[PDB]
Amino acid sequence: NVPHKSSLPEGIRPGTVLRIRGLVPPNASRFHVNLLCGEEQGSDAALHFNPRLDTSEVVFNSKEQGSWGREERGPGVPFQRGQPFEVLIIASDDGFKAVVGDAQYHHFRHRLPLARVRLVEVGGDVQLDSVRIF
């Protein structure tokens, strides 16, 4: 329904956890979690995490200067229509580790420097219960 967009006054440092709890709606096609490097339209994306129910895949990518990078795909799709979910996106010096439910899902190594991130957005077909930056 209502998407999330918030600024990060301390950015994302190693040891920062983004926790997203919500529910994939019955009619979901896809939704996204972005870690962006600016407020402006078309800012670079250090992380684009994109569960796609319509095409049965979870895509990870980065975006620089308006261009999407190399797509990575996670193993299987740990999201289903109508079902609650919990995602941790955990930053370290080496990359982002996505935890879905009770299982480590995918390790997305940094393409852009982590220190560039200063916005998080969550949107698309998703009902959010809570978005927290720890």
From Swiss-Prot:
SMART domains: Gal-bind_lectin, GLECT. A beta-D-galactoside binds at residues 68-74. The keyword NADP does not apply. Keywords: Apoptosis, Cytoplasm, Lectin, Nucleus, Secreted. InterPro entries: ConA-like_dom_sf, Galectin-like, Galectin_CRD. Its main location: cytoplasm. Residues 4-134 form the Galectin domain. It is found in: Cytoplasm; Nucleus; Secreted. It comes from the Eukaryota. GO terms for cellular component: cytoplasm; extracellular exosome; extracellular space; nucleus. The keyword Repressor does not apply. GO terms for biological process: apoptotic process; heterophilic cell-cell adhesion via plasma membrane cell adhesion molecules. Mainly expressed in stratified squamous epithelium. Signal peptide: none annotated. Induction: By p53/TP53. GO terms for molecular function: carbohydrate binding. Could be involved in cell-cell and/or cell-matrix interactions necessary for normal growth control. Pro-apoptotic protein that functions intracellularly upstream of JNK activation and cytochrome c release. Monomer. This is Galectin-7. It comes from Homo sapiens (Human).
